[PDB]
Amino acid sequence: QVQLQESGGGAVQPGGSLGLSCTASGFNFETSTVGWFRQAPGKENEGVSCINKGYEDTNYADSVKGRFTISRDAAKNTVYLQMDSLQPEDTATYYCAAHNEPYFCDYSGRFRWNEYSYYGQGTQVTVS
C-alpha cells in the first residue's frame, strides 16, 4: 500500500521560517497530487497546500495564501513545504495526503479533510 512519512516540524518564533518534508512510498507520486493538511487543537482538519507534479501546479489554503510555498522534488520523490512569517494559528500537527484518483493536469488541490485515503503520522509545528 501507500506509506507516508512527514518530518521537519519543530518550534519557531513568529516571523521565522520552517521546512516540512513528505516522503511517499508504495506508489509513484510523480504524476499525481500530493498535499499538506493540518489539525490544531480547537480547529478542524484543514488542508494548507497541494502540488501536482505532472506540471507542478500549486494550490494553497486561503488561510495560508501568500505565506507558504510548496514544491515537489522528483529526484528526492518528496514534497517540501516552506513556511515564512509563521503565526500562532499555524501551530498544528501536519499530515501529508493525496487524492484517491491521481490527477494528470493543472488541477488545484482540494483542502477538505475528507480528501485523504492513506495518511501519515504527522509532524508537529509550534509557532510560539
Added chain:
Amino acid sequence: QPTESIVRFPNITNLCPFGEVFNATRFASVYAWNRKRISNCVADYSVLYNSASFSTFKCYGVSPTKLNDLCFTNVYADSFVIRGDEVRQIAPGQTGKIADYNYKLPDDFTGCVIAWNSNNLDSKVGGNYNYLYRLFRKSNIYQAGSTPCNGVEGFNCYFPLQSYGFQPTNGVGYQPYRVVVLSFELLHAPATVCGPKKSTNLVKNKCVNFNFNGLTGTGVLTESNKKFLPFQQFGRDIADTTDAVRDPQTLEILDITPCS
C-alpha cells in the same frame, strides 16, 4: 348536450411492495445491495407526492403527475445507503466515484431518485461499521498491492481487520441516508405495468359521456336482461354493434341509446 363526462374503472388490487421502504427494518447482504425487478403490478405513487416528510424525492424524464398515463415493461428498484455529502451528487449526468466505478447510468438516465432519513432508527450510537468503498479501476485473490502473498508474510501482505473509525458524531450534513432509484424501462414486451386509474360516482338515465376501461361513448343507458356471462364481450346474434357494456363493480348489463 351531454350533461357530464364519466369514467368507470375496476377496484385496485395489486399494490407495489413499496412498503419495503416504509417498514424496512434490516440491511441487505453484502453481495446484494437491493436490486429488485418490479412487474405485473400497479405502482401507486400517490402517497409520495404528499408525503413531504423525507429528505429528497427528485425525478427526471417524466413530469410527476403523468406517471399514471405511462406504462413500462419493467421497474428496477436499486437501493443503497450512502452518506449525506454525496446526496446532491447522486444524479444522472453528474460525477462521482460510486456511480462511475461500479455500475453506469446513462447521462440522460430517466428515472426517479429518493433519499430517506435514517437518523433516529437505523443510525447506531456506537457507529455502524458496515460501510465499504471500491476505489480503483485500471481496465475492463483481491489484494490491495500488486505482488501475491501466497500465504507468506511480507510486503503488500496485511491483517484481516483493524478497528475502523466509523462514528455518528459527525454533523448534520455528514450522516448517512438511504438512497433508492426507481428506473422505468419501456421495451419490446406486452404492457403489464399500469398506473392506478381512478373513477367516480355513477349517475344513471341521463345523457352523458361514458368511458368504461377506455371504451368511450355518448348517450343514455338502459338496463338489458340478455344472457351474457361476465367474461363475454363479443357475440353474433345481431352482428352489428357493440350492444352492451358492463360495470366492473356491478355486473349489470347496460345498452345505449343516442341523444338528439
